[PDB]
Design an enzyme around this catalytic site. Structure first.
Site, PDB file in Angstrom:
ATOM      1  N   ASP A 202       2.595  -1.051  -4.676  1.00  0.00           N
ATOM      2  CA  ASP A 202       1.665  -0.075  -4.130  1.00  0.00           C
ATOM      3  C   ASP A 202       0.206  -0.453  -4.351  1.00  0.00           C
ATOM      4  O   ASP A 202      -0.460   0.109  -5.219  1.00  0.00           O
ATOM      5  CB  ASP A 202       1.932   1.276  -4.771  1.00  0.00           C
ATOM      6  CG  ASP A 202       1.037   2.354  -4.232  1.00  0.00           C
ATOM      7  OD1 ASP A 202       0.429   2.119  -3.219  1.00  0.00           O
ATOM      8  OD2 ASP A 202       0.952   3.399  -4.829  1.00  0.00           O
ATOM      9  N   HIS A 358      -3.687  -1.576 -12.840  1.00  0.00           N
ATOM     10  CA  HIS A 358      -3.700  -2.595 -11.803  1.00  0.00           C
ATOM     11  C   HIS A 358      -4.847  -3.564 -11.956  1.00  0.00           C
ATOM     12  O   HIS A 358      -5.924  -3.211 -12.427  1.00  0.00           O
ATOM     13  CB  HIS A 358      -3.788  -1.977 -10.420  1.00  0.00           C
ATOM     14  CG  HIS A 358      -2.469  -1.756  -9.786  1.00  0.00           C
ATOM     15  ND1 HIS A 358      -1.739  -2.786  -9.236  1.00  0.00           N
ATOM     16  CD2 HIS A 358      -1.742  -0.635  -9.600  1.00  0.00           C
ATOM     17  CE1 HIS A 358      -0.618  -2.302  -8.732  1.00  0.00           C
ATOM     18  NE2 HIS A 358      -0.594  -1.002  -8.943  1.00  0.00           N
ATOM     19  N   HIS A 392       2.162  -4.083 -11.306  1.00  0.00           N
ATOM     20  CA  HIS A 392       3.554  -4.327 -11.668  1.00  0.00           C
ATOM     21  C   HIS A 392       3.808  -5.798 -11.564  1.00  0.00           C
ATOM     22  O   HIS A 392       4.501  -6.251 -10.659  1.00  0.00           O
ATOM     23  CB  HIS A 392       4.536  -3.634 -10.747  1.00  0.00           C
ATOM     24  CG  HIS A 392       4.340  -2.185 -10.613  1.00  0.00           C
ATOM     25  ND1 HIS A 392       4.644  -1.306 -11.620  1.00  0.00           N
ATOM     26  CD2 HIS A 392       3.883  -1.444  -9.584  1.00  0.00           C
ATOM     27  CE1 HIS A 392       4.375  -0.082 -11.220  1.00  0.00           C
ATOM     28  NE2 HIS A 392       3.917  -0.138  -9.985  1.00  0.00           N
ATOM     29  N   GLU A 417       9.208  -6.137  -6.745  1.00  0.00           N
ATOM     30  CA  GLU A 417       9.324  -4.796  -6.208  1.00  0.00           C
ATOM     31  C   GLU A 417       9.767  -4.840  -4.774  1.00  0.00           C
ATOM     32  O   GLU A 417       9.048  -5.324  -3.912  1.00  0.00           O
ATOM     33  CB  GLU A 417       8.020  -4.022  -6.308  1.00  0.00           C
ATOM     34  CG  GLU A 417       8.127  -2.634  -5.692  1.00  0.00           C
ATOM     35  CD  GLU A 417       7.034  -1.693  -6.095  1.00  0.00           C
ATOM     36  OE1 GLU A 417       6.541  -1.824  -7.184  1.00  0.00           O
ATOM     37  OE2 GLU A 417       6.684  -0.841  -5.316  1.00  0.00           O
ATOM     38  N   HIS A 419      10.454  -2.134  -2.869  1.00  0.00           N
ATOM     39  CA  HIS A 419      10.482  -0.701  -2.681  1.00  0.00           C
ATOM     40  C   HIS A 419      10.769  -0.288  -1.260  1.00  0.00           C
ATOM     41  O   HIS A 419      11.474   0.683  -1.036  1.00  0.00           O
ATOM     42  CB  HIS A 419       9.174  -0.079  -3.115  1.00  0.00           C
ATOM     43  CG  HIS A 419       9.244   1.396  -3.130  1.00  0.00           C
ATOM     44  ND1 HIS A 419       8.318   2.179  -3.775  1.00  0.00           N
ATOM     45  CD2 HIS A 419      10.146   2.236  -2.593  1.00  0.00           C
ATOM     46  CE1 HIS A 419       8.650   3.445  -3.623  1.00  0.00           C
ATOM     47  NE2 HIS A 419       9.755   3.506  -2.911  1.00  0.00           N
ATOM     48  N   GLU A 462      10.766  -0.288  -9.059  1.00  0.00           N
ATOM     49  CA  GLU A 462      11.321   0.296  -7.853  1.00  0.00           C
ATOM     50  C   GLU A 462      12.081  -0.651  -6.964  1.00  0.00           C
ATOM     51  O   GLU A 462      11.750  -0.773  -5.789  1.00  0.00           O
ATOM     52  CB  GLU A 462      10.193   0.925  -7.050  1.00  0.00           C
ATOM     53  CG  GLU A 462       9.566   2.122  -7.732  1.00  0.00           C
ATOM     54  CD  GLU A 462       8.362   2.655  -7.020  1.00  0.00           C
ATOM     55  OE1 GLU A 462       7.669   1.883  -6.401  1.00  0.00           O
ATOM     56  OE2 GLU A 462       8.136   3.840  -7.081  1.00  0.00           O
ATOM     57  N   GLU A 538       6.196   6.063 -15.596  1.00  0.00           N
ATOM     58  CA  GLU A 538       5.019   6.589 -14.948  1.00  0.00           C
ATOM     59  C   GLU A 538       5.052   8.069 -15.052  1.00  0.00           C
ATOM     60  O   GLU A 538       6.044   8.680 -14.704  1.00  0.00           O
ATOM     61  CB  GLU A 538       4.965   6.176 -13.481  1.00  0.00           C
ATOM     62  CG  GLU A 538       4.844   4.687 -13.261  1.00  0.00           C
ATOM     63  CD  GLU A 538       4.998   4.231 -11.848  1.00  0.00           C
ATOM     64  OE1 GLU A 538       4.742   4.972 -10.929  1.00  0.00           O
ATOM     65  OE2 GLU A 538       5.372   3.092 -11.702  1.00  0.00           O
ATOM     66  N   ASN A 598      -0.852   2.801   7.109  1.00  0.00           N
ATOM     67  CA  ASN A 598      -1.421   2.730   5.783  1.00  0.00           C
ATOM     68  C   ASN A 598      -1.131   4.018   5.080  1.00  0.00           C
ATOM     69  O   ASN A 598      -0.730   4.987   5.719  1.00  0.00           O
ATOM     70  CB  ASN A 598      -2.896   2.516   5.865  1.00  0.00           C
ATOM     71  CG  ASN A 598      -3.509   3.683   6.554  1.00  0.00           C
ATOM     72  OD1 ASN A 598      -3.582   4.779   5.989  1.00  0.00           O
ATOM     73  ND2 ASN A 598      -3.939   3.486   7.770  1.00  0.00           N
ATOM     74  N   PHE A 602      -3.783   7.386  -1.162  1.00  0.00           N
ATOM     75  CA  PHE A 602      -2.862   7.103  -2.241  1.00  0.00           C
ATOM     76  C   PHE A 602      -3.175   5.832  -2.996  1.00  0.00           C
ATOM     77  O   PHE A 602      -2.573   5.578  -4.034  1.00  0.00           O
ATOM     78  CB  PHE A 602      -1.442   7.040  -1.723  1.00  0.00           C
ATOM     79  CG  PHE A 602      -0.831   8.392  -1.591  1.00  0.00           C
ATOM     80  CD1 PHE A 602      -0.918   9.102  -0.411  1.00  0.00           C
ATOM     81  CD2 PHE A 602      -0.170   8.963  -2.664  1.00  0.00           C
ATOM     82  CE1 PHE A 602      -0.356  10.357  -0.308  1.00  0.00           C
ATOM     83  CE2 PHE A 602       0.392  10.217  -2.564  1.00  0.00           C
ATOM     84  CZ  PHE A 602       0.295  10.915  -1.383  1.00  0.00           C
ATOM     85  N   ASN A 605      -5.675   6.534  -7.627  1.00  0.00           N
ATOM     86  CA  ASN A 605      -5.045   7.420  -8.583  1.00  0.00           C
ATOM     87  C   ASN A 605      -5.516   7.140  -9.981  1.00  0.00           C
ATOM     88  O   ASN A 605      -4.720   7.174 -10.910  1.00  0.00           O
ATOM     89  CB  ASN A 605      -3.552   7.262  -8.534  1.00  0.00           C
ATOM     90  CG  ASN A 605      -3.054   7.248  -7.140  1.00  0.00           C
ATOM     91  OD1 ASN A 605      -3.059   8.260  -6.437  1.00  0.00           O
ATOM     92  ND2 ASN A 605      -2.631   6.093  -6.710  1.00  0.00           N
TER      93      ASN A 605
END
Lengths: 1024, 1024
Positions: A202, A358, A392, A417, A419, A462, A538, A598, A602, A605
């Protein structure tokens, strides 16, 4: 050998990047960070090795749309159109392409292992001179610390190799390619590769050479690997340092290895041997390995509280004492062990105060420099964090070094990942991808094996739960038994994890999803058979104005033994800087680069902004995670230390008693508490509340001396209590004057002295007020029930895809944002010493009454207006966001002065950090510049508000600003807001919590919902 | 696309076969054997699918010395010098190269991943026509069931792909390469590849396309995978058959899957569904998979005793009922589970009567045809084996089918052996080889997943213990939880095995090797913490004249619950046929093809010869592994069944009583025993021993009716006992004649009637005997102490590398083969009715007396010579191999008739199968044609021996033959032996056991060693 004119032809014809079984060609084995010293004193003292040469700086760069568009001439010489760029850097950050921000959905069409034919290609080139002596003897290799996503490497026109996996270092032996003097590198970087299917994190998906590039010269006979393990006796009073050294090259009888352990300038331990390990199996042992065992008495143990490091130096030398080469590594004596059900560190039960981080930088994309790494760490330490989850993916090498030295626990995640797959484990339960996955995991482990900060290995994120996870779990357990392995995919508690590790599991609420139910964390621990520790992968989703209910987690964490903390999601907003037509910079989120589809806001955060200034919410975290707990009983303050290893040897407790903001007493007590111990501090007989009001007791743990990560005077912990309270039984003074009430058909005009109030008799609202002759209002004083939707109100609901459960959808559906006030009742009466205005309004929508509001205004002879408000909410209507009043003041004043919980923004379910006091802020600081405009700046528990020449008294929450709720609701970006004329003031009697367990499913706990049906509050509005 | 002239250039330039990270290019996913039926009736009834086309037969072949020697023209058209060869076949078996037989040492220089530059290359070509309709629609793929070791595939000049791993099927999609009509395949096979490092099995290393090649046509929308799992209720009275079907292609709404379960002609169960599995995780489930669950009442359970199979048919069809395609699979309802500490099958505790089997054929190398597979199975079943270990690699697909249908338990081994590495786990603990290893394991599992005969997964053989094993162990456990996983490397009991599984662990003797000690199996079970079952990976090393002490294992296996059998090493001698100058064939072993270095006779360790005739020892196995145990008490025979599932419904007990070979009584009792039960059979009052002699009771379990794997009248079990015995108190009859003794200085000449005996007075030995006038001896009757060394005596000792511990070394060092007889005493006396010769000899070597032998000869008046022998062995001298006499008889006679243990060859520690009776064999059958000449043919417990006109009586072991011990010792190959004039006869009083726990460390148990110091035996030699 292929020729340039058919080298691109042949190489690209093979198409390695669409073949998941080929992850690399001619890449060297992973190992620890080597520097290749030819002087063990330099090794010891960490001096820039002369055998390590950075190639960072100005490279040539050309951008193509697909591999096949590249011209063969590029392998021979630089293209005339190549630009000069700085390596490291993402090429999206220089406008060659668009950074794409999706969350779950893959940026490309999903058809594993195939990637879009059009595949943005970066052609990097470097011309550089090589020192003849490097070429005379030894091995010269090139190291790429991070190239996203896959690349081919040529050297002097000859194809060297192929690399893949954006987050791990790729090494190639260039000794057979380099020539004396001028050499040329040609690197072809592909944006999409089959590896992209396993890299679905993400984040902004960018590409290029984004970590450091360098050359390393190692002698022919060289240390190829080097492990440090540590064993302890029962009480950690003796350790055994097991050093496993592996060489490669001409193994000779006179080779010796010396491993030396230093504590600063003291050689603590030392061992020397010749190569040749003990018999491993039927055919002997490793001739090319050697194990040394150093005994350490009273090892200084490494912890995040006290990061004690040793320096290990590994000398490869001849029997005659001639140093062949030296490597070195910081060593931290610490043991990580799960026992009974608890994750222990050096015997103590950990409590993880962690945050997901991140590798993000608003200007440089994903290029992370030391400077900002240090900044991040200091901020974390200063806000009472003790752990970081590498969300991640394997982080930039330096990061771990810093965490070793500063003291943070690290969770090191494999770069996996998937996901966006359907189902998520489509690849991770598929044998054919097990090679790809295994390399990602194994290379990570080999690389970071020796860090002391690394506490937990994570298998990634994930990616569902497949057999490949089980396999890799076991592999790690086999190879590095000293750490625990964590994996949340599959439902937090599969057999591929040592720790129950879930994402956004609520404290007291079960979320029974089909297949993978997400239990409450309290329930989860107790489920028949669960013996593992539980740590939240998380939790607490800090999407803008969030962390509502954060306190509940920390309440639980402290209460339950097997709840051992978790990682907040997340550290920093992933926003990017864009420029307007005037050259001003502004924060961009998903979609702002033309990237479509997109996931909009999000990407943001964080607890801090991209520029590392902090969101209000960060202070809530700091408070909840503080290391001192306080309990007040009478005159006694019980201080409990939550330190596991360190004694409180740099702290003192400052305390103050105040009466409604007035300082009555204070003192300061040296705070001397043993790890996990208690101190009882009895206060002097505290002042007797002089008059009416509430006494408050505030304590603060202050750190006298500056530390490695804090300024002198740093406040680390605090707490406040209510003490004695005196109710004001004092009668309001009588005034020889009765507001005169003039009645027209348009209004009620009340006049007292130089004050006038005008109630617009057709609307029922106070429409205007004069002081002297100056109109005080721009907008009439009216009832307010709506909130400029927060990210937690909106969630994942969209204009082109609505999610009915989102609060904002419920409110919009209910017509909360459309309801109109029907004047029901309207009267004006003269009292013996006052004017009494009484009104009632029905807030209706499509024939349905949503709210009934009955208000009375009492203008007394002192010029004070007492407002009483009664509200009835229709029980079948989604609970109103707030219940208050608002208006627009004509006056713009400079400072806002007030008595209440502050100083920073605080909400019904995010109050605990806020302190009750007399605060004073320039108006600008009342507004919280969230990148995505929403309701912000509420201050709760306010007893008095002073602004300009107006004073409000009572008990309320308030929000004073330059933007209307409407404007905030409409505006998409912070930089598009326009300060409106005058000042907007909201005064809430009641306000709904903001939630924050996750930002995609209504997470406002029942007790913070305005569900009581009948509401009532009073407000005194006088001049001052 | 590359062009032919640069296709070999480019392809070979990449050098995939020296790059362990590239195991295959463009190879399709592994799956179960598909046949692609377009008619589910044909699927059901197993009819040759028309979509499966064999390409076996005549191919063109050229042999090169290295890849680079191949000419590009070969990709275009057949080389003028290409020969016609039959595929499948190893090219060593057509004299293009030399098959190499090493055991441990790699055939190539060890430098992973690099292989010798000279790399024998096989260029195969096939021209064939493709049916247009195959090309019109659907997918045509080519399947290579086994190409050793690595290969490149071109089709019509275009490079298709790259394959590796000799034992698993490689599939490539040729639909984009084939054209209507004439097509051409070009396959380049390399003898050495990086994969060779993981394929170091103890076998002839040969190469080429050695398993079947075929084409398969599957419709566009096709079944890609198909698993069958079986669950049971508590008592196996209800089962759930879980069928997981996976399709690939255009997934459509009208696709349906029907799974049908048949018992012969009865459709037992059936289920139909549409594609779309249940939710697996947060993002849903598998749209392209479907799970069907069939309920079966009273499943006929599959076992090796009763191989009950069902037929599962999988129909992929439209919702309208149009069959798209069908696949099918035999299903065996059986559950394998380890519980408490025991490996259970359908609830019962298994006892493994297994044998290791190599895929070997003396003429066709490693090409295994059905014919011989069936032959092998029948032999195994008929010798009471119930399990086969696929030593050490995935076997030819058909094999498993046959084992399903006949009833054998299979251990399926991954093709991984790195035995020659130093240390052994150098590769298997190295991350970079984990991809290579994983593919070997995972492809195996996917392929054989659905067989019922496969009971245990094995991770491979002798590859040490590394992290890669741990990982792969876990992977299998995750993916196929229904079976147990076994791995012996590391020391039999690491964490990567469910079963303690060791090689050549002795029954009562610990072999405490550094690092990896090898305990006695009895000890091993009890070691603090061991809870697993123990099954011997390899035990009893059948190297030629071996299996000494075999009975001890089976004694132990029956006694201990957690000793659950093991696998004998091994089934068949790996010898190859070579030809002499006359065109006769003979069995060749290591070195006989010029292959050097090599491990000589160690390729031959079978229970049967390469031509599938049996070694004597096989009957010992049959006896020890029989399924009926007998216990005799008085008149009652207790018969215990060792069957777990089947009741004895085709057996009867035949019994006989005999007096020294004369039949006195017999009978026959229907044998009716429930699984693991008992029957008491009381015998009729048995005959009263008429005269002197020993009564013997023999029982045999005979199978009246023929079975799927046996002839009618098959004997499955037997046992013999001694009953009453009468000692002969009868006095020898007096004779009116006294042998006349003439004495010279040269001899003692005794004359009685027409018989003369001549004792050579200078030697002390009986030198000659006359009957009438015919000389009876060629060689004088002398003492014999040596044995023509067996493989277990020699072990791994070599002329150019001696192993002092080997018995033969000890004997040679002691001068046993050189000791000379010094005549000590020599006298001749006349008795009242006899002549008494007394002699004494000192067998000395280098001044040391090794043996003293005192002999007396009594010639009585009936013409019988009583010989008494007393032997003294020097206690400090390695125990003599035997203690007996031998001579060379002038007479060659046709039949050998004798009373003793027989009929076949039997030794002191390998007697139990032999039965005491009157036997009679043509002399030829006294000799056991072991390929490597050694002492053979001993028969023990002999009371009477008749040969020609000679009778020996007493109690002895004897060995009668046409070869001297000397000749046997000298000769290297069976075919080089020359029948000597006359007949060699050895008569042993005592004989050392042959051993056989392993053939590299002295394994003769103490009680079978001639260690008593003083020995004595008597022998009567008369005419007849």
């Amino acid at each position: 050998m292929t020729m340039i004119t058919d080298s691109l032809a042949v190489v690209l014809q093979r198409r390695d990047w669409e073949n998941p079984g080929v992850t690399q060609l001619n890449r060297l084995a992973a190992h620890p960070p080597f520097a290749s010293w030819r002087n063990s004193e330099e090794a010891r003292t960490d001096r820039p090795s002369q055998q390590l040469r950075s190639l960072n700086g100005e490279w040539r760069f050309a951008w193509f749309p697909a591999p096949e568009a590249v011209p063969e001439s590029w392998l021979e010489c630089d293209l005339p159109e190549a630009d000069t760029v700085v390596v490291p850097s993402n090429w999206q950050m220089h406008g060659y392409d668009a950074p794409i921000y999706t969350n779950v959905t893959y940026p490309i069409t999903v058809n594993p292992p195939f990637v879009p034919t059009e595949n943005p290609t970066g052609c990097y080139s470097l011309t550089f001179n090589v020192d003849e002596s490097w070429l005379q003897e030894g091995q010269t290799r090139i190291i790429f610390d991070g190239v996203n996503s896959a690349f081919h490497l040529w050297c002097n026109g000859r194809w060297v190799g192929y690399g893949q996996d954006s987050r791990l270092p790729s090494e190639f032996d260039l000794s057979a390619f380099l020539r004396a003097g001028e050499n040329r590198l040609a690197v072809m970087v592909l944006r999409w590769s089959d590896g992209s299917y396993l890299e679905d994190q993400d984040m902004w998906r960018m590409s290029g050479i984004f970590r450091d590039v360098s050359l390393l010269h190692k002698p022919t006979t060289q240390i190829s690997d080097f492990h440090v393990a540590t064993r302890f006796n029962d009480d950690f009073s003796r350790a055994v340092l097991e050093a496993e050294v592996q060489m490669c090259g001409e193994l000779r009888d006179y080779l010796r290895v010396t491993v030396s352990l230093w504590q600063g300038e003291t050689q603590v331990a030392s061992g020397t041997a010749p190569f040749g390990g003990e018999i491993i199996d039927e055919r002997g042992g490793y001739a090319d390995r050697v194990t040394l065992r150093l005994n350490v008495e009273n090892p200084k143990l490494w912890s995040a509280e006290i990061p004690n490091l040793y320096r290990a130096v590994v000398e490869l030398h001849t029997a005659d004492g001639t140093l062949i080469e030296a490597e070195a590594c910081d060593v931290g004596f610490r043991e990580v062990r799960i026992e009974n059900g608890l994750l222990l560190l050096n015997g103590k039960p950990l409590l993880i105060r962690g945050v997901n981080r991140h590798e993000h930088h608003p200007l440089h994309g994903q290029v992370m420099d030391e400077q900002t790494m240090v900044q991040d760490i200091l901020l974390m330490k200063q806000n009472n964090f003790n752990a970081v989850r590498c969300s991640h993916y394997p982080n930039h090498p330096l990061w771990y070094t810093l965490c070793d030295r500063y003291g943070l626990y690290v969770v090191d995640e494999a770069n996996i990942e998937t996901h966006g797959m359907v189902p998520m484990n489509r690849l991770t339960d598929d044998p054919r991808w097990l090679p790809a996955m295994s390399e990602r995991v194994t290379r990570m482990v080999q690389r970071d094996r020796n860090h002391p900060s690394v506490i937990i290995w994570s298998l990634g994120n994930e990616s569902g739960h497949g057999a490949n996870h089980d396999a890799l779990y076991r592999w790690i357990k086999s190879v590095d038994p000293s750490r625990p392995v964590q994996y949340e995919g599959g439902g937090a508690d599969t057999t591929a994890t040592d720790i129950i590790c879930p994402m956004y599991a609520r404290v007291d609420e079960d979320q029974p999803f089909p297949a993978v139910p997400k239990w409450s964390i309290k329930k989860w621990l107790s489920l028949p058979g669960e013996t593992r520790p539980l740590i939240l992968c998380e939790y607490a989703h800090a999407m803008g104005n969030s962390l509502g209910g954060f306190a509940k987690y920390w309440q639980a964490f402290r209460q339950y033994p097997r709840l051992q903390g978790g990682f907040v999601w997340d550290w920093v907003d992933q926003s990017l800087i864009k420029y307007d037509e005037n050259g001003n910079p502004w924060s961009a989120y998903g979609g702002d680069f033309g990237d479509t589809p997109n996931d909009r806001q999000f990407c943001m955060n964080g607890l801090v902004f991209a520029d590392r200034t902090p969101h209000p919410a960060l202070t809530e975290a700091k408070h909840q995670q503080q290391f001192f707990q306080f309990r007040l009983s009478g005159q006694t303050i019980e201080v409990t230390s939550e330190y596991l290893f360190r004694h409180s040897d740099n702290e003192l407790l400052h305390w103050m008693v105040a009466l409604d903001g007035k300082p009555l007493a204070s003192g300061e007590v040296p705070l001397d508490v043993a790890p996990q111990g208690k101190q009882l501090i009895e206060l002097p007989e505290l002042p007797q509340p002089e008059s009416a009001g509430q006494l408050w007791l505030t304590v603060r743990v202050v750190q006298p001396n500056a530390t490695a990560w804090s300024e002198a005077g740093h406040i680390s912990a605090w707490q406040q209590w209510r003490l004695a309270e005196n109710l004001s039984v004092t009668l309001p003074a009588a005034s020889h004057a009765i507001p005169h009430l003039t009645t027209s058909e348009m209004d009620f005009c009340i006049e007292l002295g130089n004050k006038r109030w005008q109630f617009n008799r057709q609307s029922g609202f106070l429409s205007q007020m004069w002081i002297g002759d100056k109109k005080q209002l721009l907008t009439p004083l009216r009832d307010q029930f709506t909130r400029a939707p927060l990210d937690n109100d909106i969630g994942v609901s969209e204009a082109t895809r609505i999610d009915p459960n989102a609060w904002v959808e419920r409110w919009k559906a209910a017509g909360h944002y459309q309801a109109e006030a029907a004047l029901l009742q309207c009267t004006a009466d003269t009292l013996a010493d006052a004017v009494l205005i009484t009104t009632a309004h029905a807030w209706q929508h499509q024939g349905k009454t949503l709210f009934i509001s009955r208000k009375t205004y009492r203008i007394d002879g002192s010029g004070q207006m007492a407002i009483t408000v009664d509200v009835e909410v229709a029980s079948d209507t989604p609970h109103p966001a707030r219940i208050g009043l608002n208006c627009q003041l004509a006056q713009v004043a400079e400072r806002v002065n007030w008595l209440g919980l502050g100083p920073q923004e605080n909400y019904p379910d995010r109050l605990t950090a806020a302190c009750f006091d007399r605060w004073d802020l320039p108006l600008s600081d009342m507004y919280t510049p969230y990148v995505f405009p929403s309701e912000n700046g509420l201050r709760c528990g306010t007893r008095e508000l002073n602004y300009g020449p107006h004073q409000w008294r009572g008990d309320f929450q308030f929000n004073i600003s330059r933007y209307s709720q409407q404007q905030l609701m409409e505006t998409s970006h912070r930089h598009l807001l326009h300060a409106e004329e005058g000042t907007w003031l909201n005064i809430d009697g009641f306000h709904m919590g903001i939630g924050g367990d996750d930002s995609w499913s209504p997470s406002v706990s029942a007790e913070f919902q305005l569900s009581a049906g009948r509401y009532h509050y009073q407000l005194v509005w006088c001049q001052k």
